[PDB]
């Protein structure tokens, strides 16, 4: 699967993980301060989420 595509998937995977954790941490902050996960559909975490730790 790394030969059928010219793009190297390892570097893109690392970049996507970095952006993923950026989004996850800021949306974690926004739900905890606000007090509910609500209805936002772009949040990483699914609905019916009641705190992680």
């Amino acid at each position: 699967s790394r030969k059928r595509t010219a793009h190297d998937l390892r570097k893109t995977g690392r970049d996507r993980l970095g952006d993923y954790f950026y989004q996850l941490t800021d949306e974690l902050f926004f739900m905890y301060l606000s007090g509910a996960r609500g209805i936002n559909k772009d949040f990483i975490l699914p609905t019916s989420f009641t705190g992680y730790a």
């Binding site: 989004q23 941490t25 301060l33």
Partner: protein, 52 residues
């Protein structure tokens, strides 16, 4: 007639592009400006458990 290399013929060469467009990551509001130690930061971080 005339040689036509039609749209669906297998010889119709394509060229894939090296540049890969990427979604821009969502900007994060709570940068280092807010997350700081001491009393006067909106979201303070407790440093007791960092090393111990």
């Amino acid at each position: 007639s005339s040689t036509v290399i039609a749209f669906g013929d297998p010889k119709a060469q394509k060229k894939w592009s090296s540049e890969l467009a990427v979604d821009i990551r969502k900007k994060s509001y709570f940068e280092s400006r807010f997350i700081g130690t001491s009393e006067n930061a909106v979201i303070q971080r407790k440093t007791e458990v960092e090393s111990d």
